Design an enzyme around this catalytic site. Structure first.
Site, mmCIF file in Angstrom:
data_model
loop_
_atom_site.group_PDB
_atom_site.id
_atom_site.type_symbol
_atom_site.label_atom_id
_atom_site.label_comp_id
_atom_site.label_asym_id
_atom_site.label_seq_id
_atom_site.Cartn_x
_atom_site.Cartn_y
_atom_site.Cartn_z
ATOM 1 N N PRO A 1 0.827 -1.207 0.000
ATOM 2 C CG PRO A 1 -0.780 -1.522 1.671
ATOM 3 C CD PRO A 1 0.460 -2.133 1.082
ATOM 4 C CB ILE A 2 1.595 3.847 -2.210
ATOM 5 C CG1 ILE A 2 2.674 2.829 -2.597
ATOM 6 C CG2 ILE A 2 2.214 5.243 -2.291
ATOM 7 C CD1 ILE A 2 3.057 2.838 -4.074
#
Lengths: 57, 57, 57, 56, 57, 57
Positions: free
Chosen positions: A1-2
């Site tokens: 995830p970013i």
């Protein structure tokens, strides 16, 4: 995830350090994702660059 | 503060609601910002749209 | 100039086409930039993907 | 609604203030959204950070 | 490095795989950064969601 | 096509100019799009603003 988080300028390095860790742990926990896979980008906004309702904050 | 979080497709509705709540509280505590001011955008990535090292993840 | 607009699902095509035109013209006049150089990206958000105060909007 | 606008550096504060107000009403009117729910983020780009056709 | 690329929908899966590989390599060579650290996100735009000069794409 | 690339601060102006050029060509080549249509934005991240696994990178 970013994660990219827009925040108002004026917090200390220490405070932004805390933000990155706490959010990263939150993402890992919520999604059952490995902590090492979580990246967080902090983007600071100047006071003249953020509007609510067409007016400056 | 506004957080945009890119995640891989496949998560449940339940996990995404938890993600929004848990990241929002993390942001609120870390910056001493009112919870009601925190906004979170979830952005889902399809498997053919996310690359690591030039190869699909 | 490049504008990315995150909006909630549910709007009509004319509303989005109007959104694109009015925002492009507003950008052009405010900055005295040629209209042809203005680009606008509309990003729709699903109802479960947008959080305010840690709860879905 | 949330708008992030990338613009080239060099403009003064009053012009960016005008940009915020004018874009916010445009969004509000177009979408039949409350003016107060409209948020605008201005991101300035330095001249060496924006490319068109591979050149600055 | 993290790259986010907005493109109009309509490309093939093969075409997007090539984009991810080619952009990742270009970033890697330009920055002398390990290829493995390079992440690329593709974001597709629907036909009614991209404006140039106030007009639909 | 519009690419936004987040990179850590510290590179020279010429290296980033090289990055912009090489990414632009790759995008042009991969999608068979006219190079004049490719836009690239470089976004520098300060060291204290980029976290991996909850820690500064």
């Amino acid at each position: 995830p970013i994660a990219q988080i827009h925040i108002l300028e004026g917090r200390s390095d220490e405070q932004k350090e805390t933000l990155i860790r706490e959010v990263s742990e939150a993402i890992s926990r919520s999604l059952d994702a490995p902590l090492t896979s979580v990246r967080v980008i902090i983007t600071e906004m100047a006071k003249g660059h953020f509007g609510i309702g067409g007016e400056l904050a």
